């Protein structure tokens, strides 16, 4: 089938394939640049190959060397968020399967969309600066020239020169450290990734990092001030990894370390191989937000081993990971708990479809991302519509034990490969060939290609959800004369997850009367809850219900951390409230330069500014 990666301007995998990258670079904090060489080992997939094209974005190319000599290259015109193509003229034509090494000298821009450079004042320690990357989806080309498409998988080695007071880490096994032979104020850290990965999984952090061991194959890394809290927060990681291995097969990556980033990290987690990145907004104090780690761990099979061939097929990465994530939680906390989370995920799917509109092309499972920035299209849809389809199939095909056997087999079949929705579907029909009649009842075209809510809602146990719905409806249907009957005892039999779901339910019906929201603070004292998910929902409820007192609390949360799940809707809610609109816009303008590049772009679009 003719599948191209419409988000890449590089030569496709049918023309040539990168096999290995050897990255030698130096991190320059005074200039905010990464400098050095990327040597790509490339295999021709064609006869008489004489040129190839690489993805770049805001990179300065000094030179390209093949067989010890400089070769001609040309940078094409920028194609907005896709960057500029780099055509390289090979010095000798290559036969099919012939491999050569191309060494490219380059330097990044300070405005690389892959990178956030943090001043010492943006860190916990306040002495040293800090750098972290975020390559997914198509930002690797903003760090190094590459075939920036998940259809191509490579191994890599790297040597990273950094100020000696600082530590470098990568999505790779640590392979030693030395003083820098060309500067005794610098150290070189070395890295090896022996399992082939798509380039979106290359990751780098440089900062004042310490580690603590928390399991036989896990260290947690953060600035010194966060280490003790992180070790406790994530102490269940080894248990979860064991359950994940039971579901998916051997963990093949060696180490499973965790890095807790500074507050501007845009995501809850990122599944960088060997080194999952996490937001410090997870540090609730009671391990209640551990589903993020379950999700990242699950990507070590679905995403990192079996990878989407192009971003149009992103739901294969996320839907299966959610499905695995919810099984880990179900093993740990019971099947009624898995149904609670699944039911919550349907509510999130309703929110996202309501927000985009029920005919919008982004609510489709398989999307067409030609001339669409993946960062713009990013939503809960591939997560929850993908999970729903899997949960529906589970129920159709005979239950969780049966469907988990399909999942283990799917992972074995496609490990180390990149696949499309049609590969998945073909294998699903192969695996369940004795149930094809059942499969043929599925409305494939609706599920995979039609926008809006799915054509069929799965069955959900409601047991843990009922108390949330009941309390939410009491508040929604309350009149002024009913407010007196609410009391802090209403909350006594609710877990933190149930409190979150109470606020989610109520938020879906927002605004509530201002008197209701004030009563809620009076009796539940939600302003005191530090848990970031609960606090985020409470603040949105307060702002959407037009409570002015909440304006400074909402602005503070929106700006003191940068997790987009929180910062984007808080800014949007503050902009839609007339009392805070000017302050929202002004606060964005003031903070923008020190925000993450991607977060700044999206919040900017959300507010209709710059
Ligand atoms: N590959 C990572 C996703 C990614 C990063 C960069 C470019 C493309 C794709 P990823 O590992 O699933 C991150 C996920 C991790 C996650 C998802 C669901 C449950 C738990 C964890 C997460 O961070 N999503 C947000 C909230 C959110 C969920 C779903 C849709 C939109 C927003 C958050 O939690 O801030
Ligand atoms: Yb009444
Ligand atoms: Zn994910």
Curated annotation (Swiss-Prot):
Activity control summary: Inhibited by bestatin. The epoxide hydrolase activity is restrained by suicide inactivation that involves binding of LTA4 to Tyr-378. 4-(4-benzylphenyl)thiazol-2-amine (ARM1) selectively inhibits the epoxide hydrolase activity.
Tissue/organ expression: Isoform 1 and isoform 2 are expressed in monocytes, lymphocytes, neutrophils, reticulocytes, platelets and fibroblasts.
Subcellular location as annotated: Cytoplasm
EC number(s) from the headed UniProt entry: 3.3.2.6, 3.4.11.4
Required co-factors: Zn(2+)
Site (Pro-Gly-Pro binding): 271, 562
Residues that, per the record, bind a peptide: 134-136, 266-271, 563-565
GO cellular component: cytosol; extracellular exosome; extracellular region; ficolin-1-rich granule lumen; nucleoplasm; nucleus; tertiary granule lumen
The name this protein goes by in its record: Leukotriene A-4 hydrolase
Protein's organism: Homo sapiens
Gene from which this protein is expressed: LTA4H
């Amino acid at each position: 089938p003719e599948i191209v990666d419409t988000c890449s301007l590089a030569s496709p995998a049918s023309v040539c394939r990168t096999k290995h990258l050897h990255l030698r670079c130096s991190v320059d904090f005074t200039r905010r640049t990464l400098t050095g060489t990327a040597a790509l080992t490339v295999q021709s997939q064609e006869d008489n190959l004489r040129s190839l094209v690489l993805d770049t974005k805001d990179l300065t190319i000094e030179k390209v060397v093949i067989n010890g000599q400089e070769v001609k290259y040309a940078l094409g015109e920028r194609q907005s968020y896709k960057g500029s193509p780099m055509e390289i003229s090979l010095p000798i034509a290559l036969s099919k399967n012939q491999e050569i090494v191309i060494e490219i000298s380059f330097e990044t821009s300070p405005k690389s969309s892959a990178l956030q450079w943090l001043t010492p004042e943006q860190t916990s320690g306040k002495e040293h600066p800090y750098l972290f990357s975020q390559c997914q989806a198509i930002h690797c080309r903003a760090i190094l020239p590459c075939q920036d498409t998940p259809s191509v998988k490579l191994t890599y080695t790297a040597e990273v020169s950094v100020p000696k007071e600082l530590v470098a880490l990568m999505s790779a096994i640590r392979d030693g450290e030395t003083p820098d032979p060309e500067d005794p104020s610098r150290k070189i850290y070395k890295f090896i990734q022996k399992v082939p990965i798509p380039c979106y999984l290359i990751a780098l952090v440089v900062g004042a990092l310490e580690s603590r061991q928390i399991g036989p194959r896990t260290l947690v890394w953060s600035e010194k001030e966060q280490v003790e809290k992180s070790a406790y927060e994530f102490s269940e990681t080894e248990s979860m990894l064991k359950i994940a291995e039971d579901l998916g097969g051997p963990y093949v990556w060696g180490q499973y370390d965790l890095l807790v980033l500074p507050p501007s990290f845009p995501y809850g987690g990122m599944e960088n191989p060997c080194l999952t990145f996490v937001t410090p907004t997870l540090l609730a104090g009671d391990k209640s937000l551990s589903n993020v780690i379950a999700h990242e761990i699950s990507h070590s099979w679905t995403g990192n081993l079996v990878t989407n061939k192009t971003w149009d097929h992103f739901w294969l990465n996320e839907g299966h990971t959610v499905y695995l994530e919810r099984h880990i939680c179900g093993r740990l906390f019971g099947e009624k708990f898995r149904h609670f989370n699944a039911l919550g995920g349907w509510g999130e799917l309703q929110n996202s479809v309501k927000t985009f509109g029920e005919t919008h092309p982004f609510t489709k499972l398989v999307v067409d991302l030609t001339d669409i920035d993946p960062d713009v299209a990013y939503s809960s849809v591939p997560y929850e519509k993908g999970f729903a389809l899997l949960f529906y199939l589970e129920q159709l095909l005979g239950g969780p034990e049966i469907f988990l056997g399909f999942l283990k087999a799917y992972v074995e079949k496609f490990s180390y490969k990149s696949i499309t929705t049609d590969d998945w579907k073909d294998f699903l029909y192969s695996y369940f060939k004795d149930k094809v009649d059942v499969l043929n009842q599925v409305d494939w075209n609706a599920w995979l290609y039609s926008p809006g809510l799915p054509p069929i809602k799965p069955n959900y146990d409601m047991t843990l959800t009922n108390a949330c719905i009941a309390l939410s409806q009491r508040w929604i249907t309350a009149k002024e004369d009913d407010l007196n009957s609410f009391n802090a005892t209403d909350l006594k039999d609710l877990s933190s997850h149930q409190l979150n779901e109470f606020l989610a339910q109520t938020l879906q019906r927002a605004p509530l009367p201002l008197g209701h929201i004030k009563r809620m603070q009076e009796v539940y004292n939600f302003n005191a809850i530090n848990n970031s998910e609960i606090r985020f929902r409470w603040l949105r409820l307060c702002i959407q219900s037009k409570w002015e007192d909440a304006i400074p609390l909402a602005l503070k949360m929106a700006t003191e951390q940068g997790r987009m799940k929180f910062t984007r809707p808080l800014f949007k809610d503050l902009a839609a409230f007339d009392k805070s609109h000017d302050q929202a816009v002004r606060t964005y303008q003031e903070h923008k330069a020190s925000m993450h590049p991607v977060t700044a772009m999206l919040v900017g679009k959300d507010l209709k500014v710059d």
